[PDB]
């Protein structure tokens, strides 16, 4: 649903692999396209309007070149739906569209209105809403990537010893979009992947990450989330629930537990220092 070049820039995995927040990374990307033999004019055109001779054999070209470059995992097993003359979608396009409709940042009335639009879009009689949701998703992905670049270049990610710590700040690019737990958690996951692929320091490449973001400055509140260590074969089990609870109680923190996942909580801003000290000393 957009150009080949946009997909390569905005996919989390390739963006991390080629380091495309740095200008040298763009040169590496051009070397990749040159190996495939795709003209740059074709790559900048929309996928629907590309030359049919290239479209028919694209997946083999990309997998072969990716394998040579050391990207061993470019294919996935999935499903797709087709109806009418020209409506076709992969199973993931529906997910990003629905998710974007539901977690939309604009205060267009109460949050239930966003939920209502997300639910309605899952029926075939309401197809125009699906096409609207895709446009919201495109903006969401772009905002995520420029945020990650700003975070790394400004050097906000800091080691505290047993964990990596990072925090966003008001007015900087697109912070409103990351106020909710869903978008915030997914952003933080992409950030950790980018950091571990970037750094050479072995002691940095096996750590969990704790991220904090502004919730309400008029309430003096911040949202806090913790991620398990990043490895390919990890069981996805994480321990930050009981860690946050024990640290908060030992600190007597002013905090609230609200979301259904136990890894995300709300904190008063003034308590964050002693709460972090308690976490550092507890994880030891």
């Amino acid at each position: 649903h957009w150009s080949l070049h946009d997909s390569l820039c905005n996919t989390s995995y390739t963006a991390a692999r080629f380091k495309l927040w740095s200008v040298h990374g763009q040169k590496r990307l051009q070397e990749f396209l040159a190996d495939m033999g795709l003209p740059l004019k074709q790559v900048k055109q929309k996928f629907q309007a590309m030359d049919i001779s290239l479209k028919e054999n694209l997946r083999e070209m990309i997998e072969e070149s990716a394998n040579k470059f050391g990207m061993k995992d470019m294919r996935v097993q999935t499903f797709s739906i087709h109806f009418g003359f020209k409506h076709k979608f992969l199973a993931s396009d529906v997910v990003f569209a629905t998710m974007s409709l539901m977690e939309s940042p604009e205060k267009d009335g109460s949050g239930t209105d966003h939920f209502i639009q997300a639910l309605d879009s899952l029926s075939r009689s309401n197809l125009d809403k699906l096409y609207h949701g895709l446009e919201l998703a495109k903006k969401q992905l772009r905002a995520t990537q420029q945020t990650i670049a700003s975070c790394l270049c400004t050097n906000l990610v800091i080691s505290q010893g047993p964990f990596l710590y990072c925090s966003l700040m008001e007015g900087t690019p697109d912070v409103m979009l990351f106020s909710r737990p869903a978008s915030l958690s997914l952003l933080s996951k992409h950030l950790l992947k980018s950091f571990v692929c970037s750094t050479k320091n072995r002691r940095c490449k096996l750590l969990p990450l704790v991220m904090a973001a502004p919730l309400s400055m008029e309430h003096g509140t911040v949202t806090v989330v913790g991620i398990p260590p990043e490895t390919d074969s990890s069981d996805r089990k994480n321990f930050f629930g009981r860690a946050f609870e024990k640290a908060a109680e030992s600190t007597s923190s002013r905090m609230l537990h609200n979301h259904f996942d136990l890894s995300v909580i709300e904190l008063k801003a003034e308590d964050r220092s002693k709460f972090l000290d308690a976490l550092i000393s507890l994880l030891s």
Binding site: Q45, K46, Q48
Partner: peptide, 9 residues
């Protein structure tokens, strides 16, 4: 007459 959504040059 003809029409399209593709990118200009």
């Amino acid at each position: 007459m003809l029409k399209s959504d593709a990118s200009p040059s």
